[PDB]
Design a protein around this ligand. Structure first.
Ligand SMILES: Nc1ncnc2c1ncn2[C@@H]1O[C@H](COP(=O)(O)OP(=O)(O)O)[C@@H](O)[C@H]1O
Ligand SMILES: Nc1ncnc2c1ncn2[C@@H]1O[C@H](COP(=O)(O)OP(=O)(O)O)[C@@H](O)[C@H]1O
Ligand SMILES: [Mg+2]
Ligand SMILES: [Mg+2]
Ligand SMILES: [Mg+2]
Ligand SMILES: [Mg+2]
Lengths: 269, 528, 523, 100, 389, 99, 50
């Protein structure tokens, strides 16, 4: 009955996604071994929207875990409620983007993404009929944002008539945890404008002022960084150009305008 | 200088910069030299998760050993840029660079500028390439020749009982999909692996294998003659793009709206049924529907009453393999349905292996996209075989795209060694030291082969070089007796493009390394 | 209790700062001075991500270094001012600035006010410009064999010099194609339309300049053709699918046929759009947005080829090489915006990856540069050298003037100022000859870097310029002897020299006007 | 119920009184239609309704619920029946015959 | 300069913050002498401590200080020079060049002095014929590193820090018709209180088509009068950038409001925020456009900009600064602002006084013999004012 | 006292925490030892006179079984050489089922 | 559910329709001769006073 799947990307996305499954497994009474020992009928009428049953009574989830670093996969595997995930749904790399949005988008994100679409197909084959996707990523680190931006773009293309919701995180208001955080954020918002149906930010379809403060501070740092053209050769040298960044700030200014709040020569006219 | 500006910097001046690049280049070669030839030893690779990977190919090994060095990263990227172009020659790439830097250090340590050696590499690289043009032999590349070329590249990554089986499946597959014109296009040979039975059951199927079957329990499992309908249309319940909503009344109008929302999708099913009933009036043929989009349980009950085996959510690449194989047209809409757009197969049967389901398409009229079926009892065995299959397919496409083949067994590295000696006096200046050092690095392929078989490294070279002065025959090294053997009349063959790219690559990297002045790390510690 | 006045602000002043600013500038020059001349060695860096930047460029080295001293930060910035202005000369501007700033402390320790040295430096800069414009020699643009010698003398120092016969024809055939005049008398050579594509593999001798554009894309449907002879391409910007609006629209349905009637209009909308394109008879359709699955069905019926999701910048260069303009609404489609300037469209495979080639153009105004080599590190240094070769060529067309290189120009201006300072009087004479004698560092680094006696070759060159006609005599950077530059053939554009002398004097002027540092105030 | 978001629209007082009685009388015919075919035992795999349970007891019918999907398919082979995706009376070939 | 050093420093002693706010007052009222006034103010306190530490009451010092300040202003008006007696164009170059000393552009004063005077006379506003008015901060000062500081040029018009929207538009228009706008040319949409409810599926296509047709008609009303350049403070949709392509027109988006005010004033155009008129329809007459004579998009050190030259309605100026790096250019702008305010005060107040310490040395003499006629405890206070100057 | 340094080459470029076992006395003779220990654990449950085994996994679930494959499934193994012997036994369970 | 009335005369008839639905159920129970009634679902106060 309109079954939905989940995709978890990056270091931040895995940590939150691992705890997200906690609130559903215990609410429906799913044992850590995968069995079922619940005692209610309301825990079974909707068990198929999030879990795929197996032979003998095993209920496996519908999540795909992708990352460019293999060291973040075994943390979920050995943690609580980590045995129930499908062994084939783990997709890992060997290099890592290293807070590089563009390295995880074209030069090295172009190989592992082909290893993710083949996985989302076999899961979507088993379901009766699906209605949408759920993806979780970040906006500061280039490992997740660059890979997620490509991943979120290659999902909409094959499924142009399916909804898709995101639970992205946003950078800290005053402090910044990375030097190039404004660079990694402006290039990712404009790709979520016409490719998403509902987005959420956790600290005209943006939910959580009227979000106007978040976009105002990002473009202030970005403009100051771009005026001096600082740390720009890291992105242009791998396949970008100057005009690509111009479209990011021009589009970013348009969204602020849609979010509206509501000289010494004045003699004749 | 830099230490005064940034105290947290690491620098390596004067000759300390050349001592780091030489030391690490020789460190990667003492591990990569045991993988050369059919007598190399297998390696075990264990990651942090606990998986097991037994590999012998130099590209897979380099990207799995825990190595953190700046100058060991340059060599790693050179090998990657060879695997995706030529697909062979990743172990011989590391050995030559590691030895070319070793020979050039004997003259730098004697008080000689590294630029003088650089000019010698350029002259030696131009003579070696002019010598290779006259060694290659241009042949027709019939079936019997492609058996020998493919076997040389498969006998080093499996045993003899498997390479004799995998050679026939690779040579046959390339020939079946090759036309009289146009380059050979890959991505048309699906590599399917099933974890069952033994590894000697790896066969070639003249058709397609799909990793999914039918999702209804009332569908046929064996059709002896079928029409293949490849489509990319959606039979799932879909909703209007603009936000709509029903506004009904007393409970009779709710029933008039539930079956009025299924008309748009039940019209597409009724177009297929009339097409099936037209071309197959008598219950003697089948009708298989392969879709790229989903199918509702409602539409799996309408099609299963007429015996229409239907599969959903196929991969996008299979919309092109199924037209060349069968011969239909992959259509997007149903407004122009006609019998001319249907394929033809000869046997479609279902295979269930535990919890997974497979579908076989066989007996095609004139197939142009064959599939390879891999079988093995272990997870790492299916990965070891899949590496050899990739290696053997690029060794046959290279042999066809270039109408020339170079003999192997190291018989050609000896030949540049003798040619460059007589060219040494013709070069003026101190640059004769570059040619002498270049002729010493090329002789590492015979040395490693002679050392890995358990012979003497020096007593074998003098025997090989005792020939080729007294008889103009490309004599190589035997790997069972150590006697000089002629490589052109036994079956040992290499690729002309593999040796040509290797000479070009191994000289550019080792020329920039020798000119490095210092290794400076003055930037930020981490991007934070 | 604990009372303060300036909140732990660190203040320093006096002569201590002036000696601290000069020694911070001389250290920057000490890092770079070994990367000048054809015998220059190579460095590698280590960026915070993990890569390696191995290069000879003077700006690609100083821009990766993090230095905390404020006086050193000014020497990093003037490196990229030269880079963005002329392209060449990022190393000579740092060595020269250090020497012009080292010879100043000799006067500051002799009880001389820093404002006296400023007037001497600015006075001598107006005499350097007049002397350089006297020995300038004009060049002829229509001469093609001369334009190959200018570029060859600029890449004879980088790692491309082994293939100088190849990179000379790559950077010349690209600038001559970009040059274009749209309206009025505005002549522009913009390097945004010279796309450089790097592909690992092959050999460097396969690097060529195509007559069109190369895209990394493929055909949407496999049944589409992959080889068209004379295509009529139409470029789009809108998406060929049904989308939503923005005016808060909702639908209320109460009958039985209103649900399927709504779904039927989404297919009639797509057919209306497609029939507005097939009317003009294209061959290939290029769009910057997505294409639906139904819209592809109506385009294989008319034998039309479509490419989905092309970048904005890649979709701008196509209009400059085939001849067309970007249309958003397919209803306003005319005949003047159909591209009939191409002659080929094939899709190949380069190492398990499809590539789109649009070549054989009638009169293209945009091109692409295809580089092949060994690794991603090697191809990165080729791109930095080619961007240096085209910026030299662009400067010649905007200012056809040349001056002798190799060190002949530095002695020519050094001679002119030493004979002009003996007619002046006062206390301004001594800082007037230090500025002239500081220019001899350019031909002095060319002797040390090759290996030779810098105390016998320098005095044999100074006495060589005493004659009346010797303004072109320089030092050979490969052997170590004095040769005439009329036969060797080393030349450089006038725009490069004027920017190296002007930037260096102002850096010396700016850093000679500081006498205290106020460190730390939290914005 | 429809999968799209649908709602009733009552604009007169007369249509408000007849709505509750309309739904109940509609359900009586659907349950009685199955009861006329002799189907003594109805096995479902979803959620049972309170009003639908009342009419099941009225005609002496047995209602069993199995929410395990594959366990339902195993029953279809044992008795020789077919799973109906729609709430319509089976005709002749979708009636499984047991012995007790 | 004293206004920028003291403003950036963190000071928290209450007796010191008064001097910091005092400097910020001088920069606004006058614009020059921000470091000369702090030295006098702090010296006056120091000379007053020696008196208060003795048995001199603090109210006797304050009374004496107010008397000395009053008579020191009357004497200055005896020491006045009226510029009109000397050469008008030699009493402004010298007065502007004096403010240029003690800056980075000290040696280049004879070049920068002509530029400043030629930039103030161009924006001389005409009053009701009571007094000429010379507004400042009306010239645009643009920084761009590059060639030497002797390469700075004075533009006879206006300069914009903006770029053209799409690459298909022309970048050089000889006879341009400026049409300044103050509203976005995007697709129309309904307001918050207006929704669209559809009960008949057939009336859907016409409604969707009318969202992209309302903006099409508005642009056609503008281009029919002969408009060549369109300047908008808001944003322009990419669909609306195509109508300027075949029309051979330029469109610049996201232009500042302070810049549009000066462009409209200097060319005669009218800034309109809507197309409505005194009736219910929307029209666009041809009597409210601008007229320039060369609108060329020049390129300066990689990035580009748009010049507007030879405006016929009025005269306008703008200054482009060329330096070595970003630190050098930011000090040429601040030292050029101090020079523009010096010239404005001389033209407005036709009176100058000699510089180089000739006034304080003259005032310390007149105040010394003036205090000899008091004969009270105010004698000591006035004598301290003479020594403090 | 003095300290023995690290041999130049591959040993100096290894990441921390990794190990390298090369040769015949360090890799082959140690792999046989791990596999010989595995045979002595499951041998007691052979034939009619076999004995049961009490195995408790990390979920505190108790297994009293005599199958050879079930014992290996509930035992974690951290030796790579002993892991192939386990996967060789699990393949016969899916093909034959006994043995 | 949703009610969309246009005139105040139909507004008053709706309010009387809910009070007539409830009173119809209670009358049917009382006519049957029952004296004790039980129910899993809650019983409101209006039914208690009935
Ligand atoms: N059967 C054989 N006998 C002798 N030499 C061989 C044989 N097979 C391969 N070789 C030689 O071994 C060399 C290296 O092969 P191998 O190590 O398998 O792959 P790579 O070429 O990637 O190193 C080749 O140059 C080839 O000439
Ligand atoms: N063959 C040569 N002989 C002598 N000097 C040369 C030669 N080639 C280049 N030069 C000198 O090298 C200097 C430039 O060196 P380089 O570091 O490559 O570029 P730049 O320093 O201008 O960025 C020029 O002044 C030129 O005179
Ligand atoms: Mg091989
Ligand atoms: Mg240079
Ligand atoms: Mg002043
Ligand atoms: Mg048994």
């Amino acid at each position: 009955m309109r079954e939905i799947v989940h995709i978890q990307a990056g270091q931040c996305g895995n940590q939150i996604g691992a705890k997200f499954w906690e609130v559903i497994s215990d609410e429906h009474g799913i044992d850590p071994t995968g069995t079922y020992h619940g005692d209610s009928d309301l825990q079974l009428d909707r068990i198929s929207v999030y879990y795929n049953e197996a032979t003998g009574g095993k209920y496996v989830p519908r999540a795909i875990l992708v990352d460019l670093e293999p060291g973040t996969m075994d943390s979920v595997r050995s943690g609580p409620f980590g045995q129930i995930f499908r062994p084939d749904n783990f997709v890992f790399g060997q290099s890592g983007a290293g807070n590089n949005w563009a390295k995880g988008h074209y030069t090295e994100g172009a190989e592992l993404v082909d290893s993710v679409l083949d996985v989302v197909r076999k899961e979507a084959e088993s379901c009766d009929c699906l209605q949408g996707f759920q993806l979780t990523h970040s906006l500061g680190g280039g490992t997740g944002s660059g890979m997620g931006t490509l991943l979120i773009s290659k999902i909409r293309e094959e499924y142009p008539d399916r909804i898709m919701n995101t639970f992205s995180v946003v950078p800290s208001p005053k402090v910044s945890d990375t030097v190039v955080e404004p660079y990694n954020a402006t290039l990712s918002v404009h790709q979520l404008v016409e490719n998403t149906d509902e987005t959420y930010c956790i600290d005209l379809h943006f939910f959580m002022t009227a979000i106007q403060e978040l976009f105002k501070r990002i473009s202030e740092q970005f403009t100051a960084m771009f005026r001096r053209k600082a740390f720009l050769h890291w992105y242009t040298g791998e396949g970008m150009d100057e005009m690509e960044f111009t479209e990011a700030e021009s589009n970013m200014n348009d969204l602020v305008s849609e979010y509206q709040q509501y000289e010494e020569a004045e003699e004749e006219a | 200088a830099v230490k005064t500006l940034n105290p947290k910097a690491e620098v390596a001046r004067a000759q300390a910069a050349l001592a780091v690049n030489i030391s690490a280049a020789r460190g990667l070669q003492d591990v990569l030299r045991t993988n050369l030839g059919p007598k190399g030893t297998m390696k075990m690779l264990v990651s942090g998760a606990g998986d097991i990977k037994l590999t012998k190919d130099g590209n897979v090994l380099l990207h799995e050993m825990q190595i953190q060095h700046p100058t060991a990263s340059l060599i790693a990227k050179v090998a990657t840029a060879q695997d995706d172009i030529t697909g062979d020659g990743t172990t011989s790439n590391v050995l030559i660079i590691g030895e070319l830097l070793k020979q050039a250090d004997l003259y730098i340590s004697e008080g000689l500028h590294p630029r003088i050696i650089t000019e010698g590499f350029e002259a030696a690289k131009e003579k070696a390439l002019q010598f290779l043009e006259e060694v290659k032999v241009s042949r027709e590349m019939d079936r019997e020749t492609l058996i020998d070329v493919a076997r040389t590249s498969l006998r080093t990554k499996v045993h003899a009982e498997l390479a004799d089986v995998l050679t026939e499946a690779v040579v046959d597959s390339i020939l079946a999909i090759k036309k009289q014109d146009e380059p050979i296009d890959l991505f048309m040979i699906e590599i399917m692996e099933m974890k069952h039975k033994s590894e000697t059951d790896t066969s070639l199927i003249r058709g397609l294998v799909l990793d999914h079957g039918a999702r209804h329990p009332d569908m046929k499992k064996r059709v002896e003659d079928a029409y293949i309908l490849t489509c990319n249309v959606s039979l799932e319940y879909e909703k209007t793009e603009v936000n709509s909503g029903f506004f009904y009344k007393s409970a009779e109008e709710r029933e008039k709206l539930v079956k009025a929302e299924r008309k748009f999708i039940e019209d597409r099913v009724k177009k297929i049924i009339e097409l099936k009933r037209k071309v197959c009036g008598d219950s003697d043929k089948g009708f298989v529907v392969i879709n790229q989009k989903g199918i509702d349980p409602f539409s799996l009950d309408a099609l299963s009453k007429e015996g229409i085996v239907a599969l959903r959510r196929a991969k996008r690449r299979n919309m092109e393999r199924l037209t060349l194989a069968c011969g239909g047209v992959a259509l997007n809409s149903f407004d122009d349905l006609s019998p001319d757009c249907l394929g033809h197969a000869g046997l479609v049967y279902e295979y269930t292996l535990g919890e997974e389901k497979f579908t076989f398409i066989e007996k095609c009229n004139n197939p142009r996209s064959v599939t390879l079926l891999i079988k093995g009892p272990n997870k790492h065995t299916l990965t070891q075989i899949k590496d050899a299959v990739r290696d053997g397919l690029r060794a046959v496409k290279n042999a066809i795209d270039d109408g020339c083949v170079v003999p192997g067994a190291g018989a050609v590295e000896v030949a540049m060694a003798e040619a460059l000696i007589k060219h040494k006096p013709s070069v003026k200046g101190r640059a004769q030291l570059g040619v002498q050092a270049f002729a010493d690095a090329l002789l590492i392929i015979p040395k490693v082969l002679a050392q890995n078989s358990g012979f003497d490294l020096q007593e074998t070279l003098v025997k090989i070089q005792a020939e080729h002065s007294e008889s103009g025959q490309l004599v190589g090294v035997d790997l069972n007796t150590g006697e000089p053997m002629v490589a052109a009349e036994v079956g040992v063959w290499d690729n002309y493009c593999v040796k040509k790219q290797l000479l070009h690559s191994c000289t550019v990297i080792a020329t920039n390394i020798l000119l490095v002045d210092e290794i400076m790390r003055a930037g930020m510690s981490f991007l934070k | 209790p604990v009372l303060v006045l300036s909140q732990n602000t660190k203040r320093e002043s006096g002569r201590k700062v002036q000696s601290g600013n000069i020694n911070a500038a001389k250290t920057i020059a000490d890092i770079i001075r070994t990367c000048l001349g054809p015998k220059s060695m190579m460095k590698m860096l280590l960026d915070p991500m993990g890569g390696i930047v191995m290069t000879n460029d003077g700006n690609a080295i100083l821009r990766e270094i993090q230095v905390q001293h404020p006086a050193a930060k000014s020497m990093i910035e003037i490196s990229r001012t030269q880079d963005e202005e002329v392209g060449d000369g990022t190393t000579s501007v740092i060595i020269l600035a250090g020497e012009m700033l080292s010879v100043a402390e000799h006067f500051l320790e002799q009880q001389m006010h820093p404002t006296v040295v400023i007037s001497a430096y600015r006075k001598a800069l107006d005499d350097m410009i007049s002397t350089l414009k006297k020995i300038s020699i004009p060049v002829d643009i229509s001469d093609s064999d001369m334009m190959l010698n200018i570029i060859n003398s600029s890449i004879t120092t980088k790692a491309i010099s082994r293939w100088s016969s190849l990179a000379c024809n790559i950077a010349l055939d690209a600038v001559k194609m970009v040059q274009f005049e749209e309206n009025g008398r505005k002549e522009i050579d913009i390097k945004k339309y010279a796309r450089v594509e790097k592909i690992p593999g092959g050999i460097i001798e396969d690097s060529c300049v195509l007559r069109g554009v190369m895209i990394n894309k493929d055909v949407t449907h496999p049944r589409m053709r992959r080889y068209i002879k004379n295509p009529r391409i139409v470029l789009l910007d809108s998406s060929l699918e049904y989308k939503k609006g923005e005016s808060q629209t909702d639908i209320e349905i109460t009958r039985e046929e209103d649900f399927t009637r709504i779904l039927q209009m989404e297919e009639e909308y797509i057919q209306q759009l497609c029939e507005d394109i097939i009317q003009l008879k294209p061959d290939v359709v290029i769009t910057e947005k997505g294409i639906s699955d139904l819209a592809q069905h109506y385009l294989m019926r008319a034998n039309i080829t479509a490419i989905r999701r092309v970048r904005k910048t890649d979709n701008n260069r196509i209009a400059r090489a085939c001849g067309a303009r970007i249309v958003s609404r397919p209803e306003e489609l005319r005949e003047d915006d159909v591209g009939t300037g191409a002659g080929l469209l094939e899709i190949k495979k380069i190492g398990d990856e499809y590539f789109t080639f649009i070549t054989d153009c009638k009169d293209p105004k945009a091109c692409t540069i295809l580089l092949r080599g060994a690794s991603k590190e090697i191809l990165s240094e080729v791109e930095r050298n080619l961007q240096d070769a085209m910026q030299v060529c662009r400067n010649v067309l905007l200012d056809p003037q040349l001056v002798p290189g190799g060190g002949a120009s530095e002695m020519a201006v050094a001679h002119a100022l030493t004979e002009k300072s003996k007619a002046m009087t006062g206390v301004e004479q001594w800082p007037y000859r230090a500025v002239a004698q500081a220019l001899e560092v350019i031909p002095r680094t060319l002797i040390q870097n090759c290996g030779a006696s810098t105390i016998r070759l320098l005095t044999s060159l100074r006495a060589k310029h005493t004659q009346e006609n010797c303004e072109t005599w320089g030092v050979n950077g490969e052997t170590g002897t004095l040769v005439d530059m009329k036969e060797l053939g080393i030349w450089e554009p006038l725009a490069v020299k004027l920017q190296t002398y002007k930037t260096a004097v102002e850096t010396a002027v700016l850093l000679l006007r500081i006498d205290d540092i106020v460190s730390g105030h939290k914005k | 119920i429809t999968e799209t978001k649908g709602t009733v629209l009552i604009k007169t007082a007369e249509e408000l009184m007849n709505f509750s009685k309309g739904e109940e009388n509609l359900m009586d015919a659907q349950v009685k239609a199955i009861a006329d075919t002799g189907a003594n035992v109805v096995v479902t795999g979803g959620k049972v309704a309170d009003m639908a349970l009342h009419y099941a007891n009225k005609y002496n019918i047995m209602l069993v619920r199995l929410n395990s999907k594959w366990d339902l398919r195993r029953l279809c082979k044992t008795v020789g029946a077919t799973a109906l995706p729609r709430l319509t009376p089976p005709v002749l070939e979708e009636m499984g015959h047991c012995d007790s | 300069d004293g206004a920028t050093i003291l403003k950036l420093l963190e000071v928290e002693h209450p007796a010191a913050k008064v001097l910091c706010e005092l400097a910020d007052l001088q920069d606004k009222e006058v614009g020059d002498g921000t470091t000369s006034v702090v030295i006098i103010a702090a010296e006056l306190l120091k000379n007053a401590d020696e008196l208060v530490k003795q048995k001199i009451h603090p109210t006797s010092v304050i009374s004496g200080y107010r008397l000395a300040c009053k008579e020191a202003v009357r004497y200055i008006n005896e020491n006045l020079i009226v510029n009109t007696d000397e050469l008008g164009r030699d009493c402004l170059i010298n007065a502007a060049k004096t403010s240029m000393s003690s800056k980075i552009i000290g040696i280049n004063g004879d070049f920068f002095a002509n530029m400043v005077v030629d930039a103030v006379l161009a924006i001389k506003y005409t009053d009701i014929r009571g007094q000429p008015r010379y507004p400042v901060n009306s010239v645009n000062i643009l920084k761009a590193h590059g060639r030497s500081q002797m390469e700075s040029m004075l533009i006879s018009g206006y300069a914009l820090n903006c770029v053209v929207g799409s690459q298909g538009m022309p970048k050089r228009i000889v006879n341009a018709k400026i049409a300044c706008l103050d509203f976005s040319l995007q697709k129309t949409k309904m307001k918050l209180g207006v929704q669209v409810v559809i009960t008949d599926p057939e009336k859907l296509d016409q409604i969707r088509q009318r969202e992209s047709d309302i903006t099409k008609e508005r642009i056609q009303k503008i281009l029919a009068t002969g408009a060549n350049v369109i300047l908008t403070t808001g944003g322009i949709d990419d669909m609306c950038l195509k109508y300027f392509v075949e029309a051979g027109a330029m469109a610049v988006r996201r232009v500042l409001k302070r810049d549009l005010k000066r462009i409209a004033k200097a060319s005669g155009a009218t800034i309109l925020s809507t197309l409505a008129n005194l009736e219910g329809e929307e029209t666009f007459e041809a009597a409210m456009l601008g007229q320039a004579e060369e609108v060329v998009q020049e390129r300066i050190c990689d990035d580009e900009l748009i010049l507007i030259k030879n405006t016929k309605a009025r005269t306008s100026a703008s200054i482009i600064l060329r330096g070595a790096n970003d630190f050098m250019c930011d000090e040429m702008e601040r030292s050029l602002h101090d020079a523009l305010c010096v010239v404005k005060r001389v033209l407005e107040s036709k009176s100058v006084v000699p510089g180089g310490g000739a006034v304080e040395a003259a005032l310390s003499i007149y105040l010394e013999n003036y205090a000899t006629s008091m004969g009270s405890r105010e004698q000591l206070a006035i004598a301290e004012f003479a020594r403090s100057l | 006292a003095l300290h023995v340094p690290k041999a130049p080459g591959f040993a100096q470029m290894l990441k921390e925490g990794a190990k390298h076992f090369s040769g015949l006395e360090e890799a082959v003779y140690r792999n046989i030892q791990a596999c010989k220990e595995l045979a002595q654990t499951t041998r007691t449950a052979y034939g009619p006179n076999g004995m049961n085994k009490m195995v408790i996994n990390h979920l505190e679930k108790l297994f009293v079984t005599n199958d050879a494959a079930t014992i290996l499934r509930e035992l974690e193994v951290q030796h790579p050489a002993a892991k192939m012997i386990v996967m060789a036994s699990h393949m016969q369970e899916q093909e034959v089922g006994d043995g | 559910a949703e009610i969309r009335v246009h005139t105040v005369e139909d507004y008053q008839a709706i309010v009387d329709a809910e009070w007539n639905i409830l009173y119809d159920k209670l009358e049917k129970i009382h006519h049957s001769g029952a004296k004790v009634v039980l129910s899993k679902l809650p019983i409101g106060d209006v039914a208690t006073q009935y």
